[PDB]
Amino acid sequence: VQDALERALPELQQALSALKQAGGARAVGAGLAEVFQLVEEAWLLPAVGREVAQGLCDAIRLDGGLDLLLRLLQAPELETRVQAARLLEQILVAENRDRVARIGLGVILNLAKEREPVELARSVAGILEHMFKHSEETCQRLVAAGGLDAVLYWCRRTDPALLRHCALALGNCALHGGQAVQRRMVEKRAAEWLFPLAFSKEDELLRLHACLAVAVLATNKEVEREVERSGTLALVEPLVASLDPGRFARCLQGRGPDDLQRLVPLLDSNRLEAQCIGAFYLCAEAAIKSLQGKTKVFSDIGAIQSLKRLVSYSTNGTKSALAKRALRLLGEEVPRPILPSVPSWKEAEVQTWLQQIGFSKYCESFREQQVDGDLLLRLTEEELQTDLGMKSGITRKRFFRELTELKTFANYSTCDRSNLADWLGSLDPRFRQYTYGLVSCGLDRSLLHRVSEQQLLEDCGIHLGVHRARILTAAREMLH
Amino acid sequence: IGAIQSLKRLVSYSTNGTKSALAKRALRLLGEEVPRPILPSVPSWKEAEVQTWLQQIGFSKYCESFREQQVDGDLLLRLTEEELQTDLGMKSGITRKRFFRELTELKTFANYSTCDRSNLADWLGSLDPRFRQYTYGLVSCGLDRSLLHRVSEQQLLEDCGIHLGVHRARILTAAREMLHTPDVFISYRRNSGSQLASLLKVHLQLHGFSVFIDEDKLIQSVMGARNFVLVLSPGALDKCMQDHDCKDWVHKEIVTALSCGKNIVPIIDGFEWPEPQVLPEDMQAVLTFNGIKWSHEYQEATIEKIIRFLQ
Ligand SMILES: NC(=O)c1ccc[n+]([C@@H]2O[C@H](COP(=O)([O-])OP(=O)(O)OC[C@H]3O[C@@H](n4cnc5c(N)ncnc54)[C@H](O)[C@@H]3O)[C@@H](O)[C@H]2O)c1
Numbered sequence: 001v002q003d004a005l006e007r008a009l010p011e012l013q014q015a016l017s018a019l020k021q022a023g024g025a026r027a028v029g030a031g032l033a034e035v036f037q038l039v040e041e042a043w044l045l046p047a048v049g050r051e052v053a054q055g056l057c058d059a060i061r062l063d064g065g066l067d068l069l070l071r072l073l074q075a076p077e078l079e080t081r082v083q084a085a086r087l088l089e090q091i092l093v094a095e096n097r098d099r100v101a102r103i104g105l106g107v108i109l110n111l112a113k114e115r116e117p118v119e120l121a122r123s124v125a126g127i128l129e130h131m132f133k134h135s136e137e138t139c140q141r142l143v144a145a146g147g148l149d150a151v152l153y154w155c156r157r158t159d160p161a162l163l164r165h166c167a168l169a170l171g172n173c174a175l176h177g178g179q180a181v182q183r184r185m186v187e188k189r190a191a192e193w194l195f196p197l198a199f200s201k202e203d204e205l206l207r208l209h210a211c212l213a214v215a216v217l218a219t220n221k222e223v224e225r226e227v228e229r230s231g232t233l234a235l236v237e238p239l240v241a242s243l244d245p246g247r248f249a250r251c252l253q254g255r256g257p258d259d260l261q262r263l264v265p266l267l268d269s270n271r272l273e274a275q276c277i278g279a280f281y282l283c284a285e286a287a288i289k290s291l292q293g294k295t296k297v298f299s300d301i302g303a304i305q306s307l308k309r310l311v312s313y314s315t316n317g318t319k320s321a322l323a324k325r326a327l328r329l330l331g332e333e334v335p336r337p338i339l340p341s342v343p344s345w346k347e348a349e350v351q352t353w354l355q356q357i358g359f360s361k362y363c364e365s366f367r368e369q370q371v372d373g374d375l376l377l378r379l380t381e382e383e384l385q386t387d388l389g390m391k392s393g394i395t396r397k398r399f400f401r402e403l404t405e406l407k408t409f410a411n412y413s414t415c416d417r418s419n420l421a422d423w424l425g426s427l428d429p430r431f432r433q434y435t436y437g438l439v440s441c442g443l444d445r446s447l448l449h450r451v452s453e454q455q456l457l458e459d460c461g462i463h464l465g466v467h468r469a470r471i472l473t474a475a476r477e478m479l480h
Numbered sequence: 481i482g483a484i485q486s487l488k489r490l491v492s493y494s495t496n497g498t499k500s501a502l503a504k505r506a507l508r509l510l511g512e513e514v515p516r517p518i519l520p521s522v523p524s525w526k527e528a529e530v531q532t533w534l535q536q537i538g539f540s541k542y543c544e545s546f547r548e549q550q551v552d553g554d555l556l557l558r559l560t561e562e563e564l565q566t567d568l569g570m571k572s573g574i575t576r577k578r579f580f581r582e583l584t585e586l587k588t589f590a591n592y593s594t595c596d597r598s599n600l601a602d603w604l605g606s607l608d609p610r611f612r613q614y615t616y617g618l619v620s621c622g623l624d625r626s627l628l629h630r631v632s633e634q635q636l637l638e639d640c641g642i643h644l645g646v647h648r649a650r651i652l653t654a655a656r657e658m659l660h661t662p663d664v665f666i667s668y669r670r671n672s673g674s675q676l677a678s679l680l681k682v683h684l685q686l687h688g689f690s691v692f693i694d695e696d697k698l699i700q701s702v703m704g705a706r707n708f709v710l711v712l713s714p715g716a717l718d719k720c721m722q723d724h725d726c727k728d729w730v731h732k733e734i735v736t737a738l739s740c741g742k743n744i745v746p747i748i749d750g751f752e753w754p755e756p757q758v759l760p761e762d763m764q765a766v767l768t769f770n771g772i773k774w775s776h777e778y779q780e781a782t783i784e785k786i787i788r789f790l791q
Pocket residue numbers: 043088089090091092093094130133253254255256257259
């Protein structure tokens with residue numbers, strides 16, 4: 001355990017003393033090459049070299065060699081510049097990134113302007129890649145300055161190793177950026193430069209990380225229009241449909257829970273490409289964490305219930321197959337897809353729908369009351385509070401959120417005559433939940449010009465007055 | 481005095497690295513734990529982020545009050561007086577008001593990227609920085625910038641939940657006073673012509689040209705296209721030689737482009753010109769066009785040369 005640390009500390013002590021003492025033209029570069037080869041020996045140890053490399057990076061930081069590397073990045077010689085950059089690339093760990101964000105911002109940013117040689121760019125792309133993972137302030141300082149333009153210019157090259165760093169840099173800048181960083185990327189059209197990275201048939205990891213960056217940028221609701229106009233979403237769904245997560249899980253050692261929490265809101269952002277990317281990556285990393293004995297992280301975060309919602313509300317075969325495989329590689333059961341004809345439900349479909357979304361406490365609350373799909377669509381506050389024993393209003397509000405998700409994904413073919421659900425969906429996709437509110441009252445397209453607000457409140461049961469005003473306005477302005 | 485909780489608020493609500501590092505060092509030199517920075521995507525919260533946010537601001541008594549009720553970030557942003565009083569056991573109105581002060585501090589520092597389409601939070605922040613807390617009040621009701629001229633005070637009170645009438649009057653006033661067939665088709669080779677065709681498509685869509693990429697589907701793509709760009713990779717006419725049956729896709733696209741008579745612009749990347757006598761008779765006319773050599777280091781002038789040679 002402590003063997004590699006005791007073998008690797010005094011060698012780096014001698015090497016950093018040779019770097020600090022000698023100031024020659026080529027002996028300093030030879031010392032940088034010695035430190036870089038010892039770093040390559042450090043990272044390539046099976047299940048040992050992680051903590052060993054972390055301790056050696058801590059020793060390089062506490063010795064003072066990080067400021068030495070930041071001084072040698074300003075050297076006029078090109079050779080020691082590229083060796084110092086390739087040495088600084090492999091040591092950007094979470095304790096070194098704070099020190100680089102304190103001082104090294106502006107030195108690496110200066111080398112972001114020099115873009116012509118490949119030996120600089122292949123390492124400076126990875127340095128900017130790992131510096132996008134620090135915080136939102138560093139992402140703002142890199143995007144507002146010429147740090148994003150270096151990656152957007154280096155996406156033009158044909159180097160298969162450099163474009164991986166560019167795709168990972170844009171993905172990590174989209175993950176840890178926020179609102180304004182994504183605005184400054186997409187207004188500068190960062191999603192359009194990911195098109196040669198998501199289509200190039202040279203590598204298979206590179207297209208996956210490019211589609212990851214596209215899918216993370218495709219979750220901001222002020223952004224998705226220019227992403228759909230970019231045309232990079234259409235390369236996402238077949239690429240996920242043509243690969244296997246087990247082979248890429250064997251190819252990649254996973255990621256920590258702080259990065260596992262970044263893939264979870266990709267599934268609840270109701271976009272098909274983002275759900276496919278999130279299901280693929282969580283299936284591969286669930287295979288990784290199920291090879292080991294740490295499968296409780298997905299239950300600590302809560303991605304398992306989101307995968308159950310992906311299975312039970314699926315309209316695509318690829319994301320449903322990936323979510324079923326991800327739930328099969330874990331230690332719980334897979335759910336069945338629900339029957340979409342909700343007014344055609346009997347009691348057992350209601351019981352299954354309760355068992356698939358996490359309402360197993362109230363199942364016997366609905367069996368004694370004989371609630372079918374016709375009574376489930378016509379359920380209010382008072383019947384939940386009094387008749388069903390659901391006393392808590394927070395539990396009732398969670399039930400109404402799940403009822404919103406159910407009444408969005410429903411088949412109203414047995415009741416709707418004038419296709420009123422598409423009329424509600426053409427205005428706002430959160431209006432189709434009131435379809436049963438208006439069909440059961442006897443309405444169709446030829447009556448909504450004689451409906452008032454009181455008829456929508458009392459009979460149709462539309463509790464939000466903004467939705468009542470929008471439905472009355474759009475019923476009185478464009479139906480006759 | 482009480483400066484330790486203010487340092488915890490500085491750590492948990494930090495937008496600067498220097499003050500966060502100094503507050504973490506100040507809490508490390510004392511005898512208590514340092515908190516973690518919260519996840520700004522509040523509607524993307526699960527239960528554990530809500531529990532951590534409770535543990536970092538001094539609501540450790542009610543943590544088991546939220547775990548049994550399963551309150552996530554969507555329920556935390558939509559919480560009122562009555563659900564705090566009845567369902568959560570927070571009987572004291574002073575404790576509820578301290579919780580609403582902390583909820584004000586939370587809904588000021590939040591990421592609404594997954595719900596806000598028209599950037600309504602910046603519209604609320606341009607008036608008064610204490611208005612962005614009502615962003616979730618207006619996004620969840622279905623509103624954006626193009627609807628606020630038809631909102632009343634009752635819709636802000638009941639649905640949006642704006643309890644202060646001064647803020648309702650200011651939002652209504654400021655909402656009513658200041659709110660109111662492709663062109664270039666690219667043929668390429670599957671082996672080594674994908675990256676060059678993708679790069680040409682990107683550099684032509686940077687200038688506003690509708691470019692299509694990738695017999696019942698491609699003929700209507702060529703007929704609707706105004707121009708034609710032929711990517712000549714090394715080996716781009718390898719499968720087109722001795723193809724006397726019209727089965728190759730690139731051969732069909734070249735025959736269709738010659739039948740259309742469009743402005744065929746070849747793009748050469750290390751590919752010599754083939755002989756006319758080895759090609760079939762339906763594709764010998766492609767060798768008489770003005771091809772363009774491709775440079776991998778001076779691409780801007782090359783794309784400008786392509787624009788000068790297209791309609
Ligand atoms: N082969 C290589 O050359 C190699 C490999 C890895 C890292 N590096 C270098 O390391 C630096 C970046 O590494 P990083 O650590 O900052 O990455 P990171 O913090 O951005 O990603 C998290 C990594 O740490 C691990 N991890 C963190 N917490 C964990 C936990 N609680 N349980 C299990 N695993 C956990 C994950 O497996 C994941 O690999 C860069 O300089 C990079 O060049 C090099």
